[PDB]
Design an enzyme around this catalytic site. Structure first.
Site, PDB file in Angstrom:
ATOM      1  N   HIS A  81     -13.713   0.943  -1.253  1.00  0.00           N
ATOM      2  CA  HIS A  81     -12.464   1.644  -2.034  1.00  0.00           C
ATOM      3  C   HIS A  81     -12.561   0.880  -3.784  1.00  0.00           C
ATOM      4  O   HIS A  81     -11.718   1.667  -4.256  1.00  0.00           O
ATOM      5  CB  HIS A  81     -11.302   0.792  -1.372  1.00  0.00           C
ATOM      6  CG  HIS A  81     -10.862   1.523  -0.269  1.00  0.00           C
ATOM      7  ND1 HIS A  81      -9.786   2.655  -0.139  1.00  0.00           N
ATOM      8  CD2 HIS A  81     -11.194   1.315   1.066  1.00  0.00           C
ATOM      9  CE1 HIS A  81      -9.605   2.883   1.179  1.00  0.00           C
ATOM     10  NE2 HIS A  81     -10.451   2.283   1.979  1.00  0.00           N
TER      11      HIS A  81
ATOM     12  N   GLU B 228       0.980  -1.121  -0.042  1.00  0.00           N
ATOM     13  CA  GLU B 228       0.127   0.170   0.120  1.00  0.00           C
ATOM     14  C   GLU B 228       0.840   1.461   0.011  1.00  0.00           C
ATOM     15  O   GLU B 228       0.675   2.068  -1.058  1.00  0.00           O
ATOM     16  CB  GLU B 228      -0.969   0.140   1.260  1.00  0.00           C
ATOM     17  CG  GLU B 228      -1.774   1.398   1.111  1.00  0.00           C
ATOM     18  CD  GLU B 228      -3.269   1.316   1.405  1.00  0.00           C
ATOM     19  OE1 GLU B 228      -3.532   0.759   2.563  1.00  0.00           O
ATOM     20  OE2 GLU B 228      -3.749   2.408   1.096  1.00  0.00           O
TER      21      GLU B 228
ATOM     22  N   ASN C 272      -7.139  -4.045  -2.192  1.00  0.00           N
ATOM     23  CA  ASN C 272      -6.691  -4.578  -3.575  1.00  0.00           C
ATOM     24  C   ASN C 272      -7.874  -4.982  -4.329  1.00  0.00           C
ATOM     25  O   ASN C 272      -8.779  -5.533  -4.015  1.00  0.00           O
ATOM     26  CB  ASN C 272      -5.727  -5.773  -3.333  1.00  0.00           C
ATOM     27  CG  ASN C 272      -4.356  -5.534  -2.826  1.00  0.00           C
ATOM     28  OD1 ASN C 272      -3.761  -4.390  -2.765  1.00  0.00           O
ATOM     29  ND2 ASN C 272      -3.736  -6.588  -2.161  1.00  0.00           N
TER      30      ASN C 272
ATOM     31  N   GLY D  10      -1.451  -8.384   5.954  1.00  0.00           N
ATOM     32  CA  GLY D  10      -1.745  -7.092   5.328  1.00  0.00           C
ATOM     33  C   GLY D  10      -3.190  -7.131   4.997  1.00  0.00           C
ATOM     34  O   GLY D  10      -4.005  -8.137   4.277  1.00  0.00           O
ATOM     35  N   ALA D  11      -4.108  -6.129   5.365  1.00  0.00           N
ATOM     36  CA  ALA D  11      -5.602  -6.022   5.061  1.00  0.00           C
ATOM     37  C   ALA D  11      -5.868  -4.800   4.159  1.00  0.00           C
ATOM     38  O   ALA D  11      -6.351  -3.920   4.495  1.00  0.00           O
ATOM     39  CB  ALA D  11      -6.273  -5.844   6.383  1.00  0.00           C
TER      40      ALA D  11
ATOM     41  N   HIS E 228     -15.822  -1.236   4.479  1.00  0.00           N
ATOM     42  CA  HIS E 228     -14.619  -0.316   4.250  1.00  0.00           C
ATOM     43  C   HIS E 228     -13.951  -0.854   2.934  1.00  0.00           C
ATOM     44  O   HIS E 228     -13.751   0.167   2.049  1.00  0.00           O
ATOM     45  CB  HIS E 228     -13.719  -0.542   5.291  1.00  0.00           C
ATOM     46  CG  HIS E 228     -12.400   0.588   5.480  1.00  0.00           C
ATOM     47  ND1 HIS E 228     -12.312   1.630   6.220  1.00  0.00           N
ATOM     48  CD2 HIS E 228     -11.505   0.649   4.544  1.00  0.00           C
ATOM     49  CE1 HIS E 228     -11.593   2.581   5.711  1.00  0.00           C
ATOM     50  NE2 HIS E 228     -10.787   1.828   5.013  1.00  0.00           N
ATOM     51  N   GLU E 229     -13.401  -2.103   2.862  1.00  0.00           N
ATOM     52  CA  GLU E 229     -12.671  -2.499   1.642  1.00  0.00           C
ATOM     53  C   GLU E 229     -13.549  -2.604   0.358  1.00  0.00           C
ATOM     54  O   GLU E 229     -12.982  -2.581  -0.622  1.00  0.00           O
ATOM     55  CB  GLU E 229     -11.949  -3.757   1.984  1.00  0.00           C
ATOM     56  CG  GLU E 229     -11.154  -3.844   3.384  1.00  0.00           C
ATOM     57  CD  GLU E 229     -10.025  -2.896   3.405  1.00  0.00           C
ATOM     58  OE1 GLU E 229      -9.509  -2.167   2.611  1.00  0.00           O
ATOM     59  OE2 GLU E 229      -9.485  -2.993   4.557  1.00  0.00           O
TER      60      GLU E 229
END
Ligand SMILES: *[C@@H]1O[C@H](CO)[C@@H](O[C@@H]2O[C@H](CO)[C@@H](O[C@@H]3O[C@H](CO[C@H]4O[C@H](CO)[C@@H](O)[C@H](O[C@H]5O[C@H](CO)[C@@H](O)[C@H](O)[C@@H]5O)[C@@H]4O)[C@@H](O)[C@H](O[C@H]4O[C@H](CO)[C@@H](O)[C@H](O)[C@@H]4O)[C@@H]3O)[C@H](O)[C@H]2NC(C)=O)[C@H](O)[C@H]1NC(C)=O
Ligand SMILES: *[C@@H]1O[C@H](CO)[C@@H](O[C@@H]2O[C@H](CO)[C@@H](O[C@@H]3O[C@H](CO)[C@@H](O)[C@H](O[C@H]4O[C@H](CO)[C@@H](O)[C@H](O)[C@@H]4O)[C@@H]3O)[C@H](O)[C@H]2NC(C)=O)[C@H](O)[C@H]1NC(C)=O
Ligand SMILES: *[C@@H]1O[C@H](CO)[C@@H](O[C@@H]2O[C@H](CO)[C@@H](O[C@@H]3O[C@H](CO)[C@@H](O)[C@H](O)[C@@H]3O)[C@H](O)[C@H]2NC(C)=O)[C@H](O)[C@H]1NC(C)=O
Ligand SMILES: *[C@@H]1O[C@H](CO)[C@@H](O[C@@H]2O[C@H](CO)[C@@H](O[C@@H]3O[C@H](CO)[C@@H](O)[C@H](O)[C@@H]3O)[C@H](O)[C@H]2NC(C)=O)[C@H](O)[C@H]1NC(C)=O
Ligand SMILES: *[C@@H]1O[C@H](CO)[C@@H](O[C@@H]2O[C@H](CO)[C@@H](O[C@@H]3O[C@H](CO)[C@@H](O)[C@H](O)[C@@H]3O)[C@H](O)[C@H]2NC(C)=O)[C@H](O)[C@H]1NC(C)=O
Ligand SMILES: *[C@@H]1O[C@H](CO)[C@@H](O[C@@H]2O[C@H](CO)[C@@H](O)[C@H](O)[C@H]2NC(C)=O)[C@H](O)[C@H]1NC(C)=O
Ligand SMILES: *[C@@H]1O[C@H](CO)[C@@H](O[C@@H]2O[C@H](CO)[C@@H](O)[C@H](O)[C@H]2NC(C)=O)[C@H](O)[C@H]1NC(C)=O
Ligand SMILES: CCOC(=O)C1=C(NC(C)=O)Oc2cc(O)ccc2[C@@H]1c1cccnc1
Ligand SMILES: *[C@@H]1O[C@H](CO)[C@@H](O)[C@H](O)[C@H]1NC(C)=O
Ligand SMILES: *[C@@H]1O[C@H](CO)[C@@H](O)[C@H](O)[C@H]1NC(C)=O
Ligand SMILES: *[C@@H]1O[C@H](CO)[C@@H](O)[C@H](O)[C@H]1NC(C)=O
Ligand SMILES: *[C@@H]1O[C@H](CO)[C@@H](O)[C@H](O)[C@H]1NC(C)=O
Ligand SMILES: *[C@@H]1O[C@H](CO)[C@@H](O)[C@H](O)[C@H]1NC(C)=O
Ligand SMILES: *[C@@H]1O[C@H](CO)[C@@H](O)[C@H](O)[C@H]1NC(C)=O
Ligand SMILES: [Zn+2]
Length: 858
Positions: free
Chosen positions: A309, A136, A273, A269-270, A305-306
């Site tokens: 994005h 990131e 992507n 890692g969160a 949240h993810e």
């Protein structure tokens, strides 16, 4: 001499197309790769500047389209910016496309950053392996040479060599998986859409899947084979939100696949992507019979949240790390916004309100910083990653959605995501898109720049003299012993007839004109604005009265905002503390969770600051008073997991209150529930909402404490274990409390990741208060090895061992520690804000201690 001497890449050459072939081994933690980068020049240059780190370059071949032949070129390095330079054999000319191919050797990472790899133990004690990608900030340059800025978008073709057992995934759906005569499968995935380098992802691990197609979009969740049964809430939630965001943003999910990976390591890692949404394993596991309500809210929010994005942040990316507060602030906003239209049962507004309470306390400190800064250093990149800046940004976007309409907000986002789709931008362009959909009536770009380019937040003073409410503006300065103006969107509620209007204060002084003569007024409705309101002496006392006679004329959000405001204003000395306790004297008629939890928060901070000062008797009279205010609400609670999700949290708050302070029957009800559980060898069910309360009361005995230790080192749930761990650190045996902290630092029985949780729990109670800060001092060098300076862990450890000191003796002690380490260490924001909160605790006593000795014990 390196041809470029700047941190940002030149605006000359631009990538268009990436071909990446990789052969990862994982058993060796070494990988080999070749990249083919199709670039174009918009300016003329003899040198192509790009990013690479930790690569043994074997060959670099330049080629124009006017030949089918590859040409040699020399390559230089400047590792301070990770930049590599390819000198050109031909002067690259404007518009003309050229092609660079680089072959290299490199190691798979072990720092969980870049192309990382690790090992794990399965249902049998089998060493299965796994690799993944976290890039990131600036780690895409560690896996392959590229233009590692988010503005330099391109398309990607990912090719990776695997072994048949290990599933290989990437961003795009897979196209060609061919078997090789070596015995190894090579997978190729489809060519990407135009995306930034930090969002590329690829994963090689032994997994299974629980997939479901919707509208051609195949949403899938991948996890280690022993855990596919616990991903069903994640898929059911990932589908209801992919529908919601698509119909909210009015753009379809751009790609064909949506894969969610639960990586089997706790330091994973969160990131967001595109297509390959990475999470941690514990972040996606849920079971409808064993997990908690707070365990449900976390999974339901981390997916939202993810997922947000995939439009805001990947389709339309920010150009530089100066605006990461806007990307992550929008998704942090979309967490609570999506989970209130389609998951309204969870009462997520109570979480956003507490998160905005805590964001305001740390933004009020003079060590706070404006969110919009200049990022010209790599440390400045890696210090834009602040959860405070992400939550202040969501707090500003809430203020925009409430000042404008909800529909005006959406029309700006849909138009912004249409105009700047598949490209990169800045934070001012979103404010520009608001100015288009408001028909150039008001200027959002000026209104927001008062909050983005400025530190802290306003204090809006209010005095109603008749039908004229006088509003004044100031900065919440806490030193209580330059800044500019804010375009503050004001809101009020008055009353047996109710009014609700919206204004805008663009001056230091203003007056709003009321339509009647009213008896009580409340500014900042539901605390949707990022400000604190100080009412006058008469105006506060009206609201204190209307809370006695029908408090439910206001919302639970508004009654919590008054408890938070009057207690924080009292600590600065603007209000006497006896007025805040007059306000919460209404709490006998309070049934909602959000005003009670905040009132229990403010009283616990007073209890614990007074307890460490030694005024134990006065501290007990404080909690034996809030208990008498909340006595009927506590006794009415059942030791179960039943009710609405909000009422399932008031139970966990009120029972933890009565048990920590041994008030009423709580402790004997928990000890019976503990003793039955301990004697079932952990096989009896405990209700999840009373589980930690029961574990703590039982951990106060050598018998029950030693039982819980064996359950931690054996049982499987890393959520039920973290309630066991909290209970073990709630002991009053100092020897046990030291042994817990010693063990985690050395990695015995507990992991070093949990040490931040142990020191925070040991130090918040009296038997381990001095013991925690002594452990931080005497193990500091080993702590800065295991966690680097400026990490969130080293900030949480320092604040968690120091935030309850309230003496000048302690302030000099903590100061003299960090000064006699490094001037670097003394200028960290963790130690400057820590020495600042000791001063605010020193003065809170100077403004409120001797007065408390009067009304309490009388
Ligand atoms: C509610 O009702 C009240 C009362 O009617 C409204 O308040 C008045 O609003 C008008 C419109 O903006 C103000 O007129 C402006 O005055 C400034 C400066 O003039 C000075 O006049 C007085 C001395 O003679 C003094 O009382 C004023 O004090 C105010 O402002 C100071 C400093 O800003 C502040 O400290 C005070 O607390 C007062 O708030 C002031 O010093 C003048 O420069 C303006 O001219 C500019 O703006 C107009 C358009 O606004 C434009 O046409 C001009 O060309 C020029 O660009 C303008 O004359 C008036 O002063 C306000 N009075 C008070 C007591 O506040 C209020 O607006 C209503 N609110 C709503 C929502 O309806
Ligand atoms: C926490 O406590 C407060 C205070 O008691 C509580 O608010 C109350 O909620 C009830 C339920 O909605 C309200 O009662 C209704 O009021 C509306 C007017 O807004 C009426 O339309 C309703 O009348 C219907 O039902 C009556 C019997 O319930 C019938 O007699 C009638 O003919 C109608 O069919 C009903 O009166 C009540 O007014 C409020 N009170 C206040 C002071 O706000 C709140 O709900 C509680 N929250 C929780 C979570 O328990
Ligand atoms: C990475 O390099 C290692 C060698 O350094 C390769 O290790 C090989 O791993 C495979 C795993 O499938 C082993 O194959 C297995 O062989 C046994 C017989 O020994 C058979 O019973 C299994 O069904 C399977 O076919 C193989 O033995 C092993 N080779 C060794 C140890 O020399 C690995 O393939 C490389 N990975 C990649 C992606 O290149
Ligand atoms: C699509 O996106 C472009 C950006 O790529 C938008 O252009 C921007 O439009 C705003 C609105 O006027 C411009 O703001 C103004 O800029 C001038 C100076 O340029 C300044 O003096 C004003 O105070 C105001 O800030 C902005 O500059 C402009 N940017 C660019 C690069 O052109 C465009 O409006 C969008 N259109 C649609 C239909 O979405
Ligand atoms: C009470 O709880 C303790 C845990 O503190 C139990 O001891 C552990 O029990 C588990 C199974 O519940 C044992 O795992 C088993 O291991 C054997 C091989 O020894 C294997 O064949 C089984 O399939 C299973 O995996 C574990 O060994 C055992 N011991 C320890 C030190 O953890 C205890 O059994 C419980 N008491 C009762 C009466 O159930
Ligand atoms: C992969 O790891 C090996 C570990 O040995 C690295 O090898 C060392 O690298 C440093 C820096 O390049 C050298 O100063 C040491 O002399 C090397 N030691 C040995 C024993 O080889 C290797 O550099 C890493 N891979 C890459 C591509 O840098
Ligand atoms: C796991 O992934 C496989 C591969 O996509 C899924 O199997 C497909 O399921 C679809 C329906 O979603 C069927 O139309 C296809 O015929 C299946 N193809 C293959 C090759 O299996 C599977 O359903 C996914 N989920 C689970 C729980 O296994
Ligand atoms: C989710 C955890 O993922 C990671 O491991 C890293 C990431 N990821 C994200 C989403 O921030 O970036 C940063 C940014 C920082 O400012 C500081 C540390 C990191 C670490 C890091 C860096 C070097 C070695 N080990 C870990
Ligand atoms: C890269 O690794 C090979 C493998 O032995 C080595 O011969 C070579 O010197 C290294 N460096 C370069 C620049 O190729
Ligand atoms: C470079 O490639 C793009 C993509 O096809 C093309 O549109 C452009 O015309 C190419 N440049 C030249 C000079 O042909
Ligand atoms: C299904 O996906 C296609 C993709 O273009 C879209 O046009 C269509 O509206 C979708 N149907 C829905 C969302 O019901
Ligand atoms: C606030 O912090 C800055 C940063 O060093 C400092 O210069 C200033 O004196 C501080 N203000 C107060 C009132 O301490
Ligand atoms: C902006 O102007 C357009 C003109 O067609 C109108 O439809 C729209 O309602 C206006 N928006 C606002 C917020 O006034
Ligand atoms: C506590 O338990 C005793 C047992 O008889 C009971 O009389 C008393 O009412 C209980 N009190 C509460 C608050 O539950
Ligand atoms: Zn995010």
């Amino acid at each position: 001499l390196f041809p470029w001497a700047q941190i940002r890449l030149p605006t000359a050459v631009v990538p268009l197309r990436y071909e990446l072939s990789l052969h990862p081994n994982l058993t060796s933690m070494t990988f080999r790769g070749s990249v083919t980068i199709s670039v174009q020049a918009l300016q003329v240059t003899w040198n192509i500047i790009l990013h690479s780190t930790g690569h043994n370059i074997s060959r670099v071949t330049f080629m124009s389209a006017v030949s089918s032949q590859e040409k040699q070129a020399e390559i230089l390095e400047y590792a301070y910016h990770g930049q590599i330079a390819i000198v050109a054999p031909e002067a690259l000319l404007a518009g003309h496309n050229y092609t660079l191919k680089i072959e290299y050797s490199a190691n798979i990472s072990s720092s969980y950053y870049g192309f990382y790899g690790f090992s794990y133990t399965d249902e049998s004690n089998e060493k299965k392996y796994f690799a993944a990608t976290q890039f990131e900030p600036l780690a895409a340059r560690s896996a392959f040479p590229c233009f590692d800025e988010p503005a330099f978008k391109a398309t990607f073709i990912i090719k990776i060599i695997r072994d048949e057992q290990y599933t290989a995934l990437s961003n795009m759906p897979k196209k060609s998986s061919v078997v090789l005569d070596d015995g190894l499968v090579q997978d190729e995935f489809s060519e990407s859409v135009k995306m930034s380098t930090y969002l590329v992802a690829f994963i090689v691990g032994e997994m299974k899947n629980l997939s479901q197609d919707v509208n051609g979009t195949l949403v899938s969740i991948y996890a280690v084979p022993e855990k596919i049964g616990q991903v069903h809430y994640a898929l059911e939630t990932t589908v209801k939100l992919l529908e919601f965001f698509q119909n909210y943003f009015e753009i379809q999910y751009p790609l064909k696949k949506l894969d969610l990976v639960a990586i089997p390591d706790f330091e994973a890692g969160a990131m967001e992507n595109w297509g390959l949404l990475t999470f941690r394993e514990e972040t996606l596991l849920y079971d409808s019979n064993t997990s908690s309500m707070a365990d449900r809210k976390l999974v339901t929010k981390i997916i939202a949240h993810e997922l947000a994005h995939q439009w805001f942040g990947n389709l339309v990316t920010m150009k530089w790390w100066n605006d990461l507060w806007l990307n992550e602030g929008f998704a942090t906003f979309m967490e609570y916004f999506s989970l209130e239209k389609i998951f309204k049962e969870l009462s997520s507004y109570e979480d956003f309100l507490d998160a905005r309470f805590k964001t305001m306390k740390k933004d009020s400190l003079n060590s706070s910083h404006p969110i919009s800064s200049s990022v010209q250093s790599s440390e400045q990149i890696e210090e834009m990653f602040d959860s405070l800046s992400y939550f202040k940004g969501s707090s500003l976007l809430l203020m925009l959605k409430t000042y404008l309409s909800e529909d005006v907000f959406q029309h700006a986002v849909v138009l912004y995501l249409h105009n700047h789709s598949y490209a990169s931008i800045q934070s001012d362009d979103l404010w520009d898109s608001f100015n288009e959909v408001t028909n150039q009536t008001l200027d959002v770009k000026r209104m927001m720049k008062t909050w983005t380019l400025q530190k802290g937040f306003p204090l809006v003073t209010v005095q109603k003299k008749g039908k004229e409410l006088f509003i004044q503006q100031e900065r919440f300065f806490l030193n209580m012993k330059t800044s500019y103006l804010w375009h503050i969107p004001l809101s009020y509620v008055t009353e047996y007839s109710k009014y609700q209007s919206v204004s805008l204060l663009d001056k230091k002084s203003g007056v709003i004109n009321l339509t009647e003569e009213v008896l009580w007024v409340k500014v900042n409705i539901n605390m949707n604005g990022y400000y604190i309101v100080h009412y006058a002496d008469d105006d506060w006392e009206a609201l204190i009265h209307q809370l006695k006679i029908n408090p439910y004329v206001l919302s639970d959000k508004d009654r919590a905002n008054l408890i938070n405001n009057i207690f924080e204003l009292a600590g600065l000395g603007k209000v006497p503390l006896k007025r805040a306790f007059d306000l919460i004297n209404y709490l006998g008629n309070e049934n909602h969770t959000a005003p009670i939890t905040e009132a229990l928060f403010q009283t616990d901070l007073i209890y614990n600051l007074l307890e460490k000062l030694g005024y134990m008797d006065l501290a007990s009279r404080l909690v034996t008073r809030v208990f008498k205010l909340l006595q009927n609400q506590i006794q009415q609670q059942t030791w179960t997991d039943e009710g609405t999700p909000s009422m399932r949290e008031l139970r966990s708050a009120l029972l933890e209150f009565a048990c920590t302070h041994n008030l009423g029957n709580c402790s004997t009800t928990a000890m019976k529930l503990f003793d039955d559980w301990m004697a079932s060898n952990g096989t009896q069910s405990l209700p999840t909402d009373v589980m930690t309360t029961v574990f703590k009361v039982g951990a106060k005995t050598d018998k029950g404490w030693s039982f819980l230790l064996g359950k931690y080192i054996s049982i499987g749930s890393e959520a039920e274990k973290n309630k066991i761990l909290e209970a073990l650190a709630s002991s009053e045996d100092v020897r046990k409390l030291y042994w817990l902290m010693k063990s985690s630092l050395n990695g015995d029985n507990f992991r070093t990741q949990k040490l931040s949780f142990i020191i925070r729990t040991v130090g918040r109670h009296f038997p381990g208060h001095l013991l925690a800060w002594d452990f931080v001092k005497e193990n500091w060098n080993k702590l800065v090895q295991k966690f680097p300076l400026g990490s969130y862990t080293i900030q949480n450890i320092v604040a968690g061992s120091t935030y309850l000191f309230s003496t000048k003796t302690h302030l000099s002690e903590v100061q003299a520690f960090f000064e006699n380490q490094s001037e670097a260490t003394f200028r960290l924001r963790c130690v400057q804000e820590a020495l600042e909160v000791i001063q605010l605790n020193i003065q809170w006593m100077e403004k409120n201690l001797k007065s408390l000795t009067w009304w309490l014990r009388t």
